[PDB]
Amino acid sequence: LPDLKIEKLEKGVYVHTSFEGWGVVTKHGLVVLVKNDAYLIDTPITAKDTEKLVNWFIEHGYRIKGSISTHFHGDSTAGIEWLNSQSISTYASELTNELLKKDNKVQATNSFSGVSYSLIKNKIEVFYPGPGHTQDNVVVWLPEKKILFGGCFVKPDGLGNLGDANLEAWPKSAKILMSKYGKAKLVVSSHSEIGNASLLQRTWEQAVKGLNES
Ligand SMILES: [Zn+2]
Ligand SMILES: [Zn+2]
Numbered sequence: 001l002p003d004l005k006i007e008k009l010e011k012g013v014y015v016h017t018s019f020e021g022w023g024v025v026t027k028h029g030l031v032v033l034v035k036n037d038a039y040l041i042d043t044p045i046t047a048k049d050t051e052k053l054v055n056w057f058i059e060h061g062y063r064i065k066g067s068i069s070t071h072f073h074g075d076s077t078a079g080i081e082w083l084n085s086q087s088i089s090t091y092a093s094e095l096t097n098e099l100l101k102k103d104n105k106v107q108a109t110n111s112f113s114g115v116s117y118s119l120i121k122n123k124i125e126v127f128y129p130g131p132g133h134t135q136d137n138v139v140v141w142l143p144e145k146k147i148l149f150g151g152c153f154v155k156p157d158g159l160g161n162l163g164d165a166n167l168e169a170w171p172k173s174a175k176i177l178m179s180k181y182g183k184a185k186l187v188v189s190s191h192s193e194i195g196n197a198s199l200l201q202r203t204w205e206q207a208v209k210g211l212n213e214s
Contacts, residue, residue: 004049006031006056013145015188016053018044020075027075027190030149031057032142034123040067041124041140041149042190043079050079054086064088068119068126069108070151071137072099073164075190081106091119093128095136127180129153130173131166132207139177146185153177154189156202159210167214170207178204 001024005017012033019026029042031053038057043050054064066089069076077100080090084106092100092108100107117126125141133152140149152160153173159165178200181187187199 004044004052006053009147009186009188009194010145013142013147015194016040016044018046018049018053020045025075025191028188029076029190030140030147030188032124033062034065034120036062037065038062039065039119039124040079040083042070042076042151043067043083045075046078047082050082053079054083054088066091066119068092068124068140069096070140070149070153070190071134072096072103072105073134073152076151077105077108080108084109093117093126093136093138096138099134099136129177129180131169132173133159133161133170134164135166139181141181141184146183147188148181148184148186149188150177150190150199150203152190154187154192154199154203155206156189156195156199157192157206159206160191162210167207167211171204171211174200174204174207 001019007015014031016029027045032039068091083090090108091110094111094113097107097111115128128138137153184197
């Protein structure tokens with residue numbers, strides 16, 4: 001397995017890539033800085049990689065102040081248990097926490113009930129477009145940077161794992177997301193290369209295509 005990668009996207013924004021009878025999953029997340037405080041957008045795909053990530057940031061002088069997981073699957077949440085052990089505030093939607101609990105997995109400490117939620121006002125915003133990749137999937141918007149983290153919902157190449165997906169809802173959800181974040185300069189996804197707002201349209205096309213095929 002390749003090692004955890006941390007790559008600066010721009011001032012205050014880093015992409016973390018971690019890796020895990022299939023084969024090997026590549027998983028992108030972000031770390032976002034508010035002054036010297038760092039916030040994980042999705043944990044790495046393992047607890048060990050979450051520890052490595054946190055340590056890298058600590059060793060560069062940043063305080064890890066919180067993490068937000070975009071859906072209940074391990075690739076967004078693997079590190080929550082370890083983060084809780086460090087007294088690092090973990091966040092997930094109430095639906096995501098309910099699905100974690102249902103799977104006997106460790107829950108985020110903090111949660112939120114709304115479709116729209118500000119983790120930090122004007123800097124890190126959370127939005128639920130509706131079901132797609134999973135029932136609970138949310139996206140994270142960085143207004144100051146015009147960057148959207150779409151997690152496992154933006155799937156401009158193919159929809160990937162359908163095991164917990166809602167094929168009938170995904171096209172509508174995807175249109176909702178396109179309408180809301182046409183303003184996005186960059187769209188960062190869990191499993192594809194970084195692009196612009198057109199990846200939202202690509203995702204809608206893949207959702208339509210995939211629903212037809214079912
Ligand atoms: Zn997933
Ligand atoms: Zn995924």
